[PDB]
């Protein structure tokens, strides 16, 4: 509870120090009420001057409506379309990769967006905030982390070795190491894997500038379900388990994963 008050001090500045909001979000978990605000400031959706906030959100609102309306003009979306699919189509239009028809199949990258859009939907209730956060969150993965994300699978082994080499050995025994759901962990950032109440505490860190956190979440999953995994003896049996993990343990997993991340990377 003492943590929440120190944040409110940062939020009272007429001009928000984005640097300090990161270092806070890195160290501490965000209060539920302030999550949307902080994420928006860090992602550049809102500027640091919180007198402009109202005026800027107006632009973001008009943009949302303009785009959405355009999709209805070209018969790309109707009221029957799910909201996550709408956000996808809006994102495609804004980034200039709208296909010719809705019937055209969805490519791998589109299904990543769709998984995240569904996760964000539970975290953020406002349609406009949800879209804009999803947008900038996913855009961050393909720009700020374009060269970082592909190197996480290598790091996942390296750091698992440092916490439990025998478990790593067992994975390599079953030739299961190469077939782990790396795309679920490091392209979708655990969207569809962990429940959103826990997952958002992970995304606190991803927004605030660190993608390496995702590795230590993945590591902690294996540590947590060690006994269960060591019982299995097939790459296919192992992967199938990791794609449908128990949802009740995820609260602990995230907490432990953050400690693990702080331990190995020694954040300021």
């Amino acid at each position: 509870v003492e943590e929440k008050k120190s944040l409110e001090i940062l939020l009272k500045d007429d001009r928000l120090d984005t640097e300090k909001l990161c270092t806070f979000s890195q160290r501490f978990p965000l209060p539920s009420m302030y999550r949307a605000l902080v994420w928006k400031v860090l992602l550049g959706i809102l500027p640091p001057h919180h007198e402009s906030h109202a005026k800027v959100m107006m632009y973001r609102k008009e943009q949302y409506l303009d785009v959405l309306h355009a999709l209805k003009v070209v018969r790309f979306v109707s009221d029957a379309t799910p909201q996550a699919e709408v956000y996808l189509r809006m994102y495609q239009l804004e980034s200039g990769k709208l296909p010719r028809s809705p019937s055209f199949p969805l490519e791998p990258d589109d299904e990543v967006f769709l998984a995240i859009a569904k996760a964000m939907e539970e975290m953020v209730e406002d349609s406009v905030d949800c879209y804009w956060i999803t947008r900038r969150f996913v855009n961050q993965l393909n720009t700020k982390y374009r060269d970082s994300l592909p190197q996480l699978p290598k790091a996942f082994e390296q750091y698992l070795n440092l916490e439990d080499g025998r478990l790593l050995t067992h994975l390599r025994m079953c030739s299961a190491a190469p077939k782990l759901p790396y795309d679920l962990w490091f392209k979708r950032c655990f969207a569809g894997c962990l429940p959103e109440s826990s997952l958002q505490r992970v995304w606190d860190k991803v927004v605030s500038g660190s993608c390496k956190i995702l590795v230590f979440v993945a590591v902690e999953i294996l540590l947590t379900f060690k006994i269960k995994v060591m019982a299995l003896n097939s790459a296919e049996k192992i992967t199938k388990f990791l794609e449908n993990i128990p949802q009740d343990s995820s609260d602990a997993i995230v907490s432990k994963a953050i400690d693990l991340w702080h331990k190995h990377c020694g954040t300021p």
Partner: protein
Amino acid sequence: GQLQAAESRYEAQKRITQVFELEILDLYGRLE
């Protein structure tokens, strides 16, 4: 800050135009 958002609006409108442009061309092509 405010200016970035204003340019965001312009760019987005530009993209809408380009989509409509192609939709029109597609429609002319169909009507033949």
